[PDB]
Each structure stands twice: as structure tokens, then as C-alpha cells.
Design a protein around this ligand. Structure first.
Ligand SMILES: Nc1ncnc2c1ncn2[C@@H]1O[C@H](COP(=O)(O)OP(=O)(O)OP(=O)(O)O)[C@@H](O)[C@H]1O
Ligand SMILES: Nc1ncnc2c1ncn2[C@@H]1O[C@H](COP(=O)(O)OP(=O)(O)OP(=O)(O)O)[C@@H](O)[C@H]1O
Ligand SMILES: Nc1ncnc2c1ncn2[C@@H]1O[C@H](COP(=O)(O)OP(=O)(O)OP(=O)(O)O)[C@@H](O)[C@H]1O
Ligand SMILES: C/C1=C/C(=O)O[C@@H]2C[C@@H](CC[C@H](C)/C=C\CC1)O[C@@](O)([C@@H]1CSC(=O)N1)C2
Ligand SMILES: C/C1=C/C(=O)O[C@@H]2C[C@@H](CC[C@H](C)/C=C\CC1)O[C@@](O)([C@@H]1CSC(=O)N1)C2
Ligand SMILES: C/C1=C/C(=O)O[C@@H]2C[C@@H](CC[C@H](C)/C=C\CC1)O[C@@](O)([C@@H]1CSC(=O)N1)C2
Ligand SMILES: [Mg+2]
Ligand SMILES: [Mg+2]
Ligand SMILES: [Mg+2]
Lengths: 52, 333, 351, 345
């Protein structure tokens, strides 16, 4: 029953790789949690750059 | 037939892939704290009990799916897989994230889950079956906490409740008489104006206590953690923030699919409260749907059951052969 | 706090300098009613797009959209916030003058700045040099940039983008047997596109595979329950980006235009460009596009040249983010056109 | 995939760049047997510095081959190091990595810094306090300000010892090495920092609310009271164990006050705590109270203590090593071949 619907969906679904490429998931070997913080570094560095 | 084992901080839910509800549900006694296994010996014990005492099966004859918490360390699951294969010589096994299975039980593969049990609460946004780890929100306020709070403020009313057994009694009182107010201040006012909100509970020693505003002050913590001295935000705010950390394009998909799961979501009214608050926080053109199936205290387990029965799932099992070749690590892939 | 407004052909991205993702993102349409307000009341509303191919072409409806932005979505008093707007490469000076005017006179903003989209994209990646492929809903640009300045002569406009790929999808989907022609049907198809389309590493090989099995086939549920099946269409659609002829365009593909763009730049800086391809915008979100562009540019570029295609996950919003970053830089605060400056000099001062 | 190795005085945290947690965490000891396998004991790392290169070679070997199950020649490896680590020491680290383990590439990073990174910052002051050493390390746009660093040889192991002593004073014998491990357990499970020490002592005199019970392995069950907080209070009052030094609050403050005044605000608003010895309940608040009492009254004080923090250094490493943009920082085997150890600097 419910199981049948869930199955349907589960079959027609994207690979994490895809989702990353579409920007819904984080990478792709880069601490998924702690992504917030990675992105935060990234942004920092780039800032320090631009002010310099 | 496969086994399904939802290893919680307070209750173990064990059963057979297929069934609508777990065959066995028993106290997790605490080897599990805040959703994480922290005593592998006592855990081995609990598992043994599960297989041999409650389920009456030979673990080597059944593929087994275990659940785990969001943010569970890979080392953790590796230890799980090992214990499963080496200590219990299971034929095959799979580990799944609780919130996810909850979502599955509702027939969805996308949406945000509020999973709140005895020892921990999580907001876990999920897209096409995958959790967005960066958007997960842990919150160390759950069932047990609300019980403790109830002991305290009940005492403040004049009733002594402090011993462990007294704690169990209070937990009963909680489950049977507590509820979430649509509006906390209004409810407090009503509670001041009459005795309509007052209810009675009989203790085992015959004596009969009366509980009033406590009935809803209690669960109110879930929305106002400050009540127990937590600097954190409430479940509504965390849901919201979690959504707001997700790729904006999928946020609508999230808002329209709030799935609530776990014992601590069983309070009458919580659903509506969450609807009111999220509505107040979310854009005014967004559709908000809060899904709270009556079955939900067991929805995680049910999710498992369903997942495990899907023919198409049988290709996902880590087999004893696969383990033999690759070692614990193989669970991660 | 400053405002950042990326006024696109399909979506407005608005927010506050300093935030890493725009607070508000809504359709660039005015039915009067704006945005999702207009989306809901579809039956009673007639939809218009004030922005076409990256250029503002209806100043009244634009004034409307801006108003909506300030007052409805952002909930701010425009006179209390410096505001940075974006604009397209090759935007006429008269255009920006009209923008500045509307900003100062209609919204009495304290200060404002106008920046080129592609550039901001580049900035968000922490670079000030490289070539950008910016491809949104209504237009695509190759914009080479050196030390923060666009090389206008080397820019390449291409009137093939998101909306086009959606239309193409409606067509070939129909050819498969599924009717999709109405406006609403078009929105559904756009969903399908975003969720199921991708770029093949090799178009012919992919077509062959699509002929040999059903591995490439995927299913999509329509709102009316019915469930359609889409196959090779999944990758032919965005292939258009590389083979415009598919929709009857005589132009070259995004790879060829990138290349040509580079080849119009002062040869000495070309290496700097090749090693810094930045992709930005919703139409670059197809899985595989990055790799495809790497393969093709490699095939076109000298064999001793290093090719790097940068496609940050954040990219659908990288223009906006670039804005945010730029606007937060202390050192930038001296670039704002102030209301005083406007009062003395008039619109022209923006240039 | 790259390796990340946080080589501590008490625990090795090893894993793969790309993960949220370290895959392996084991005692930094050699008994020959390494790590948990080995449980006569030797600690190759003292006060954050490698002081026995042979046993260190051992522990590294164990890490690669036993705990991680990898071929070191197939993985770039990032190692951590302490603030104030001698040129010479990192020289030998590098040499051992390339020659003894033929790694493809390697990088060495300062622990406090990585802590900071894990919190999404590139500026702020870190209090990193592990098992054998504590540091205040101010960091401005990614660079440690070496002159403002403060070393303090008071840490986890110390607080454990102190606990053995004052526990004995209460009547319980605890002196053997094993007894020391037991006491360490008690510490982690029952100790905490008082918001204010005198008030807490008074309360501890007035009742048994602060008293807690702990079961030993031999069944016997001991009771610990004011000791629960007397122990960690050492971090703020080193005199308790006969140290003439200042407390972690005072050292944080002084550190800041040695920094270019203009950046001080940036520091005050970004105190990041990291390491096992910062895990005491209440420490954060305590540090907030004290720094507030020391700092200008117009300054904003924020003490950041992520739950993840016992592992934040390692996590910092992970994050750093995963950054595409970082891949250009690795010392390669080629680079080493041309330039020699020195190239690490
Ligand atoms: N009807 C109810 N109303 C309120 N609370 C309830 C109700 N029923 C159960 N609970 C509470 O639910 C909590 C436990 O449920 P649950 O089984 O989901 O915990 P768990 O999943 O094992 O723990 P965890 O989710 O942290 O791993 C208990 O605290 C219990 O008191
Ligand atoms: N995952 C996806 N796959 C395919 N297309 C996508 C995807 N996500 C977004 N798009 C498309 O991107 C387009 C919008 O991009 P974006 O909103 O950044 O540009 P814009 O600024 O509004 O338009 P323009 O750059 O032309 O002025 C839409 O057509 C949208 O359908
Ligand atoms: N919850 C806790 N409360 C108090 N101390 C703790 C707690 N958990 C761990 N510790 C202590 O942390 C210390 C070790 O932690 P840590 O892993 O940070 O050491 P280390 O980093 O390897 O040493 P070092 O940083 O000095 O090089 C031990 O002394 C241990 O007892
Ligand atoms: C009936 C029942 C309810 C329950 O969930 O209890 C589980 C398990 C229990 C373990 C001790 C208890 C005496 C054993 C079994 C109780 C099982 O602790 C809990 O009650 C904890 C302690 S207080 C609280 O609210 N939750 C959770
Ligand atoms: C969900 C969404 C996507 C989008 O970018 O849509 C933007 C704006 C939108 C306005 C019409 C639509 C009914 C209103 C809002 C849809 C916005 O039209 C578009 O979808 C058009 C239709 S097909 C296409 O790719 N662009 C572009
Ligand atoms: C549980 C645990 C904690 C720890 O960090 O231990 C690390 C390393 C360990 C090495 C010897 C010990 C007997 C072996 C394993 C204990 C590891 O000793 C320590 O506990 C030392 C000794 S007492 C103390 O506080 N730190 C530090
Ligand atoms: Mg649970
Ligand atoms: Mg755009
Ligand atoms: Mg350390």
C-alpha cells in the first residue's frame, strides 16, 4: 500500500552527485555538516582578498 | 524475513519487516544517550536481548536493519556493523537514519522532519530521500527533560516527586494529562480564571493529586527552552531556521511537508501550535502543512518495515560476504 | 545596512549586504499585483515580464516590481538603505541613467550603485580576473574580465537561455505524445526540466544508450496524478546550449562562444582566462554541464593550456552573493552615488 | 582522499579529509604495542611537543596501518602541531613523513588555528586546552600572532592528578596508574566549573545537593562533593596545584592585551574554546563572567563553545583539507625531493 507509493518514488530519484551539481546537497567529500562553516571560511578568505 | 530494530534512547522498537507495528517495545536499559550509542557492552546486551528474548529468532537467519540518529559518527556505524556481523553473525544488515524512515512512513521522500523522542530532538530536512546534513538541527531537550521539568513544577505546587520511581509516575502523568496550548499566555489566563483546565490523577498509593496549568506549562518548554534554563530556540524556531538553511528553491517543498514523529510529538495540540507558529514565521504566500499521523510514535519503526519489505531494496543490504571482503567501512558506501 | 537587488528576467533576488543568500526571490512579473501574489490569482491576472533578455523594457512595471521589493518582500524604508542594483553586460547608459533616476526620485534612496552581473559572479568566487558564463532565464553571456573590469568588446550575448530550453522541452515532449502548450503547462514543464534534465558528456553516445535501453528513462508525476515518462528528452533539451540549431538558431554553442570570447581578448591574458571559467545562473545548474564545458574547451584550446571550469553549488545565486560581498567591503563605501552627488550632478553621475 | 592526523599529548585523532568526525581516536602511548592494543607505558608527546621520534614513528605507523587501514603512499596527509613548535621539530616531522612513510604529499597546521576554522572564522582568540597543555592563541585573518600566544603547562592530566589528591584527602585512596584512569573517568563525568567559586563552596557546606555518586569497577560506590568543582577551578586558580601562573581567564585577557589594540574588539567578540579540558559544564559562562569583569565595559564578549569542540581541531583539519582551493598548499614528494625538509616552513 503506502509501501507501493514510497517504492514508486524511491525508484524515480536523483543521485546525490546530481543534487550536489544542482546545489541542493553540499559536496561530495567536504564535511557535509560543517558545510555552514566551510562556506563561512570561503566567504571570509574571499573577503580578506577583496579588501586587500 | 528481515528484522527491524529502532534503537532509541528510551525504548527499543523491534519487529519484522512486513508488520504495521513493532512486535516488541521495551525500555532501553541507559546505553543510549541523546540518540547515540555510548556503551557498546550494554548495547551488545540489549541487542542480544532483542534477538533472543523479545523476538525469539536466530540472528544469523535474518537480515537486520538498525536505525541511527542524524549526525551519527561514521566510526559509530562501523562499530554497529562490526558488532552485528561478528557478535551476531547476521546474514546481512543495513543502517538507516531515523528521521528519514519517519518521512518514508508518510509516503514522502522530501520534506522536513521533527523527530523528538525521549532523549533528543532533531529537525531533519530531506530531499529525495537524502538528509541535508548541514541543515540538521540537534536539540538536547526531549521527553525525559519534559518529565523532569514536570517533577520540579509539580513539587512547586506542593507534591513531592523526586525519586526514580516517582519520576516514572510523573512520566505517566505527563503522557496522560499534558498538552500544548495554542496560545500560552491566553491559556495561563484561563488557568487563572477557573478550574476547567484542572485534571485529577490517581497515584498507585491511592492518594489522588490535582494538576492544572502544569498540564501545558510542561510541553510549553518545547517552544520555550528557557523554562528549563536552555539558551536554545524552540522547536518552531528550529524548524524554521533549518528550512532557512536549505537551498531556497526546495524550501516550499519543505514547508508543505512538515512530518512530526516520536513520543514527544504526541501531545494533543502540538500539531496546531506548530502550524500557527510556522505560519507566523514563514512567508505569507507559502503553504504550510503539518503532518502528524496517529501512528507516529512508531512511524520511524514503520518506515523501516516498509523500506525493508520493498523488493527493490534487497540490493542495498550489506551481506556477510561483502563485509568479509571490505570490513566495517563498507557500511558507509 | 545596504540592499542588494539582482533584477533578472525571470527572478528577482533581493536581500541585505552581508547575508550569504538573498532574503527574497520572486518571479519578475507584474500582473496591479507582483510576484507570488500574481502567481496565486492567475485566473484574474494577466502576466507580463518587465525584464526581457536582461534589459529593463517597461519602466512602469519595473517601478512596480521595485516597490514590491522594498515594501512587500524586504519590509524596509528605501530612504534608509543604500541600494546596489545589478545590470546586464551591454546595458545602455541611458538605461542605467533611468535606473538611477527612478531610484533617487521615486524611492528617495540615500545612496545607490549599479554593477554588472557577470562581474559580481566572478567576485563571489574570490577572483577579479577570468571569464564568466552567466546564463539565466532569458539571456546568456560570455563576459571576460580583467582586474574587475569587463572587456566589453569580447562580451558575447546569446538570446538562448532558461525559458528557451523550457519551450524546447514542451515541443519535444509533445512529439513524444504528451500535450503541453498552455502557460500553466509551461510552468509544469519547467519543473520537469529543473528536476530531470542534464547535459551529456557525449551527445551521440548518450543518444545511442537512450536507444539501447530504459536506464536513462525517468518518471515525473503531474499535479493531476497522471505520471509521465521522459527519456532522451532529458538531455537533448540542455544540449541546445551547445547546439542552438536544435531550436533553429544560426548561432554557436556556449562552448564555442566562450572560446571565441577568449580568442578576442589580448592574447597575453588568455591563459588567465582559460584557468578561470566561472559558471553562474540557473541554466548552468544542469548536472554534467561543467564537465561538458571542460571537455569541449579542452578540445578547442591549445594543448599546453590549463582549463579550469568553476561551478560552485551556490551558483544559481552567485551574482547576488557577489553583490552582497562587494557591498559589505568597508573599502567599497566610497563608491556609492549619494543623494547629494545625484543632486549636484544628475543621473549622468552613475557612469 | 587525504588523511588528517591530530597528534595530541593524550589522544590521537585520525581520519579522512571529507568527514565530520575522526574515524579513529586512541591513546597517544606506546607500551611494543600502540594505542588501544596496548591497553609499561610511554607518552611520546608531552605538552604538545613530540619528544620521542622513534615511538612517534611507531604511533604514526599504527595510525596508517592499524586504525585507518590505508597505504600512506596513497594519501596526502595533514598533521597538526602545537603553537610555538620549533622549526627543528616540524623538520623531523616532515622528514619522517616523506622518508619513513613515502607519503605523496603532506601539510602541517597549528591546532588552535584549525579550531578557529571549524567555527567558520579566520579571526578571533582560541583557548585550546587538551590533556597536557593549554594555549591562548590570538589569530588575525588566518595568522597566529606568535608574540601574543600564551603557553600554560596546566591541563587535563594535571586536573586529574589534582583530583586524585583531594579525593584522597576526603578518605578515598587513589594513587596507582589504573586508579588514575578511574579518577579521570570520575572527572569527565562529574566535574564542572562554578560560576563563582566562593558561593559554590558555601552551598557545598550548607547541604548535599552538590554531592554525587560514582561506582567503581570493584562495586564499591564513592561519593564526591565540592571536589566536583574544586578540581577544574584549577584552570582559574593554578595556585591550587602550586603554580605561580595566572588562570585561563587572565591569560586570555593578557593575550588580547598584547595584540595590536585595533584588532582587540575582533578578538573579544570571538573567543573560541576547544579541547577536552574545555568540556566542563559551566566553563563557557565562567569565562564570559571573568572576561567581562576584566574587559572594557563597552566591549562585546562572545564565548564560542561548540558541542563538537573536543574534536574541533580535527574537524578544522578535515574542512581545510577538503577545500579545493587548499590543494595548492600541499608539500609534494617532488617539492620535498628538490628542496628538503626545510620546504615545510
Ligand atoms: N502520549 C505521550 N505524550 C507525551 N509524551 C509521550 C507520550 N508517549 C510517549 N511519550 C514520551 O516519548 C518519549 C520517548 O519516545 P521515543 O520512543 O520516541 O524515544 P526514543 O526514540 O527511544 O529516544 P530518541 O529519539 O532520543 O533516540 C518518552 O519520554 C515518553 O515519555
Ligand atoms: N536545476 C535546474 N536545471 C535547469 N534549469 C534550472 C535549474 N534551476 C534553475 N534553472 C533555470 O534557471 C533559470 C533562472 O536563472 P536565474 O533566475 O539565476 O536568472 P535570471 O537572472 O532570472 O535571468 P537572466 O540571467 O536571464 O536575466 C530558470 O529558467 C530556471 O528554470
Ligand atoms: N567531558 C570532559 N570533561 C573534562 N575533561 C575531559 C572531558 N572529556 C575529555 N576530557 C579530557 O580531555 C583530555 C584529553 O582531551 P584532548 O583529546 O583534547 O587531549 P589532546 O588534545 O590529545 O592533548 P593536547 O591538546 O594537550 O595535545 C583528557 O585529559 C581528558 O580527561
Ligand atoms: C512504561 C515505560 C515507559 C518509558 O518510556 O520509560 C522509558 C524507559 C525508562 C527506563 C526506566 C523505567 C523504570 C523502565 C521502563 C519504563 C518503560 O525511562 C524513561 O521513562 C525515561 C525516564 S523519565 C522519562 O520521562 N523518560 C523512558
Ligand atoms: C517557480 C518559478 C520558477 C521561475 O524561475 O519562473 C520564472 C518566473 C516565472 C513567472 C511565471 C510563473 C507562473 C511565476 C512564478 C514561477 C517562478 O516564469 C518563468 O518560470 C518562465 C516560465 S518557463 C521559464 O523557464 N521561465 C521564469
Ligand atoms: C579513556 C581514555 C581517555 C584518555 O584520553 O586517556 C588519554 C591517554 C591515556 C593513555 C593511558 C590510558 C591508560 C589508556 C587509555 C585511556 C583513554 O591516559 C590519559 O587518560 C591521561 C592519564 S590520566 C589523564 O587524565 N590523562 C590521557
Ligand atoms: Mg527514536
Ligand atoms: Mg541573472
Ligand atoms: Mg590537541
Amino acid at each position: 500500500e503506502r509501501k507501493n507509493v514510497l517504492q514508486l518514488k524511491l525508484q524515480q530519484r536523483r543521485t546525490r552527485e546530481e543534487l550536489v551539481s544542482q546545489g541542493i546537497m553540499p559536496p561530495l567529500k567536504s564535511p557535509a555538516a560543517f558545510h555552514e562553516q566551510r562556506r563561512s571560511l570561503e566567504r571570509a578568505r574571499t573577503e580578506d582578498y577583496l579588501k586587500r | 524475513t528481515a528484522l527491524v530494530c529502532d534503537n532509541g534512547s528510551g525504548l527499543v522498537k523491534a519487529g519484522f519487516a512486513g508488520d504495521d507495528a513493532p512486535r516488541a517495545v521495551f525500555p532501553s536499559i541507559y546505553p543510549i544517550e541523546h540518540g547515540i550509542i555510548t556503551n557498546w557492552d550494554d548495547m551488545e546486551k540489549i541487542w542480544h536481548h532483542t534477538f533472543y528474548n523479545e523476538l525469539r529468532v536466530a540472528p544469523e537467519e535474518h537480515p537486520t536493519l538498525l536505525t541511527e540518529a542524524p549526525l551519527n559518527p561514521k566510526a559509530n556505524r562501523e562499530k554497529m556493523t562490526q558488532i552485528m556481523f561478528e557478535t551476531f553473525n547476521v546474514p546481512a544488515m543495513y543502517v538507516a537514519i531515523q528521521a528519514v524512515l519517519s518521512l518514508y512512513a508518510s509516503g514522502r521522500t522530501t520534506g522536513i522532519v521533527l523527530d523528538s523522542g525521549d532523549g533528543v530532538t532533531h529537525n531533519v530536512p530531506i530531499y529525495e530521500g537524502y538528509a541535508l546534513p548541514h541543515a540538521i538541527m540537534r536539540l538536547d531537550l526531549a521527553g525525559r527533560d519534559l518529565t523532569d521539568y514536570l517533577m520540579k513544577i509539580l513539587t512547586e505546587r506542593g507534591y513531592s516527586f523526586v525519586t526514580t520511581a516517582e519520576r516514572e509516575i510523573v512520566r505517566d502523568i505527563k503522557e496522560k494529562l499534558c498538552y500544548v496550548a495554542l496560545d500560552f499566555e491566553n491559556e495561563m489566563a484561563t488557568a487563572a480564571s477557573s478550574s476547567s483546565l484542572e485534571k485529577s490523577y490517581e497515584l498507585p498509593d491511592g492518594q489522588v493529586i490535582t494538576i492544572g496549568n502544569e498540564r501545558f506549562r510542561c510541553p510549553e518548554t518545547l517552544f520555550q527552552p528557557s523554562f528549563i534554563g536552555m539558551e536554545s530556540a524552540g522547536i518552531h524556531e528550529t524548524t524554521y531556521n533549518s528550512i532557512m538553511k536549505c537551498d531556497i528553491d526546495i524550501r516550499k517543498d519543505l514547508y508543505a511537508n512538515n512530518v512530526m514523529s516520536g513520543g514527544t510529538t504526541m501531545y494533543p495540540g502540538i500539531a496546531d501550535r506548530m502550524q500557527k507558529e510556522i505560519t507566523a514565521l514563514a512567508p505569507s504566500t507559502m503553504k504550510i502543512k503539518i503532518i502528524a499521523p496517529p501512528e507516529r510514535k512508531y512511524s520511524v519503526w514503520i518506515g523501516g518495515s516498509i523500506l525493508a519489505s520493498l523488493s527493490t531494496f534487497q540490493q542495498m543490504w550489506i551481506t556477510k560476504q561483502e563485509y568479509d571482503e571490505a570490513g566495517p567501512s563498507i557500511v558507509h558506501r
